[PDB]
Structure formats: C-alpha cells, structure tokens
Design a protein around this ligand. Structure first.
Ligand SMILES: CC(=O)N[C@H]1CCN(c2c(Cl)cnc3[nH]c(-c4cn(C)nc4C)nc23)C1
Length: 246
C-alpha cells in the first residue's frame, strides 16, 4: 500500500511554496500523472509542524469532492516527505487573475458558487483549514476549481485572538469575491501593520465599476461580528449569485 521515490518519474517544477517544491510526476507502473509535493522533515521540525501536517494529511486523504484537490497517498525516506496529489492542468487562480487582471461577474460568481459548495462539504465533514488564498486555488481540466492544502485573508476574530468557528469561511469568500472582481484583496496595504488595522476595522472601499448586487453580498460577507454573517446556503441562494452563476 506504500511506495518509494523509485516508482516515479519527476517532471518539471510546479511551485516553490513552503517547505519544499512540487514536481509534476508520473507513476511508472500505471503511467498515472500526478503532482508530487516534497517537504523536508528537518525544515518541518524547525517549525515543529509535524503533528499538524500529518493530522491535515490523514483527513484530506479520505475527502472526496470535485472542488477539492484529491490526495492519493504519501511516504517518507530520510530527509524528506512526499505527497501524492491530484494534478490540476490549468494552474492556479492567482495566475489567471494576474493574466486577466480581474474577473467578470460570470466567472466570479461561478467560482464563489464552487467554493461555497466545497466549504459546506468541508464543514459537514468537520474539517477546517480556514485560510484560502488564490495561490492554493487550482483549476481542473474543465476549468473547475480545486482547493489545495498570509494576513490579507484572515478574519478579524482570528488576528484579534478571539474565538472563531465555521463563520470564518464566510469572511474568506468575501475577501475572494472582492479580489476576483477588483484584482486586489480589500484590505491590501503596503504594510503588515496597516493591513492588520484595516481587517480589524473592516476598512474597505468599492471601485466605481463594482455593481451594487456584488457590493451587497460582499458587504454582508465582510462583517466584523461573525454572528452577523449569513449561512453558506444563503450565499448560493443570493440573487447576484443565481443571476450570474453557471
Ligand atoms: C507548496 C505547494 O503547495 N505548491 C503547490 C502550488 C500549486 N501546485 C500544484 C498542485 Cl499541488 C497540483 N497541480 C498543479 N498544477 C500546477 C500548475 C501551475 N501552473 C503555472 N501550471 C500548472 C499546470 N500547479 C499545481 C503546487
């Protein structure tokens, strides 16, 4: 049921990332194309993120959803840890955003609709990974979204140190929707300290080209008090979503 690094042909690099790169790979026996994530135990141990990692790993392994990057397996050698992941051929949403500068309401709503589903599944399954950047959002063959696995995407309750629950996801959707439409996250600043202040105060403005249908949803998502954020079902049922989703 386990493996080795001898069973893979390593291709081009896909990203630098965190504690090691990710390579395009191919299982020799089956010719299965996949993404191989490499992480150094030593570099892992220096931040001690070994329990949290393997905890995160074991759970994702059993998760099955179109909008979540499949994890097939894992193993280690001596100096590093290998993750066998679903290969998303169309890259990250962040790059597409970089190329397209910004998204239309059609693509945005469709993305948000895809995400809201995934988080609902993630919530029901009682799994939590709270923070979602476009850097960790991947695209499938059909252009479908893929969730894989930093202050700008954190909710006020998290940076303040207060308690938090499933409502922090709603915040993320709000930040992403805005960024998708504008090309910049709402609370972007040239300073960590300034971003912090703006998240805690919820200081943001809409560019003129943003429709009041989108302003509404975003405004209702980016509430400081988590209790006043809508349920996920409400997002999917939102008129601006329905009108522009796919
Ligand atoms: C450290 C870490 O998590 N790196 C992750 C980022 C996305 N990533 C991918 C993962 Cl985990 C799986 N498949 C990918 N495909 C791509 C890609 C990027 N471009 C520009 N074109 C393609 C195709 N990236 C991935 C590796």
């Amino acid at each position: 049921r386990q493996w080795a690094l001898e069973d893979f042909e390593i291709g081009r690099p896909l990203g630098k990332g965190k504690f090691g790169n990710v390579y395009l790979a191919r299982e020799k026996q089956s010719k299965f194309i996949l993404a191989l994530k490499v992480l150094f135990k030593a570099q892992l141990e220096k931040a001690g993120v070994e329990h949290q990692l393997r905890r995160e790993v074991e759970i994702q392994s059993h998760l099955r959803h179109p909008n979540i990057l499949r994890l097939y397996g894992y193993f280690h050698d001596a100096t590093r840890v290998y993750l066998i992941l679903e290969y998303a051929p169309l890259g990250t949403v962040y790059r597409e955003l970089q190329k397209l500068s910004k998204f239309d309401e059609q693509r945005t709503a469709t993305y948000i609709t895809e995400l809201a589903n995934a988080l609902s599944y993630c919530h029901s399954k009682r799994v939590i990974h709270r923070d979602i950047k476009p850097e960790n959002l991947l695209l499938g063959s059909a252009g479908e979204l893929k969730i894989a696995d930093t202050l700008d995407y954190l909710p006020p309750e998290m940076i303040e140190g207060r308690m938090h629950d499933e409502k922090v996801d709603l915040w993320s959707l709000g930040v992403l929707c805005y960024e998708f439409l504008v090309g910049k996250p709402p609370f972007e600043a040239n300073t960590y300290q300034e971003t912090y202040k703006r998240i805690s105060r919820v200081e943001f403005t809409f560019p003129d080209f943003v429709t009041e249908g989108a302003r509404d949803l975003i405004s209702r998502l980016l509430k400081h008090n988590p209790s006043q954020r809508p349920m996920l079902r409400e997002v999917l049922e939102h008129p601006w979503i329905t009108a522009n989703s796919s």
